[PDB]
Amino acid sequence: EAPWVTIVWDDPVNLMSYVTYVFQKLFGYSEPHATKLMLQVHNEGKAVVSAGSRESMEVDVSKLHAAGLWATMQQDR
Ligand SMILES: CC(C)C[C@H](N)C(=O)N[C@H](C(=O)O)[C@@H](C)O
Ligand SMILES: [Mg+2]
Ligand code: NI
Numbered sequence: 751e752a753p754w755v756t757i758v759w760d761d762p763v764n765l766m767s768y769v770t771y772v773f774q775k776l777f778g779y780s781e782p783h784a785t786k787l788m789l790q791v792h793n794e795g796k797a798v799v800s801a802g803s804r805e806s807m808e809v810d811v812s813k814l815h816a817a818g819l820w821a822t823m824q825q826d827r
Pocket of ligand 2: 826827
């Protein structure tokens with residue numbers, strides 16, 4: 751019943767510019783939004799990047815994995 755979130759985890763390989771681009775490409779986010787989330791990943795170690803049903807977050811995780819980003823999902827409490 752609960753809503754879920756997709757989290758992207760910091761990784762030591764992917765370019766900062768790539769991560770900003772992926773968030774725009776996969777989610778349609780604006781450049782300031784994508785950059786903000788990228789920097790949160792890089793400076794906090796992780797960031798919630800999207801939110802919704804468990805099934806919707808399963809798709810976001812799969813899309814992010816195909817892009818090569820470290821994504822997981824968990825219930826939002
Ligand atoms: C947003 C995260 C994944 C950035 C990386 N931790 C990072 O430091 N990337 C570097 C960079 O963009 O210069 C190199 C390692 O790709
Ligand atoms: Mg929460
Ligand atoms: Ni880094």
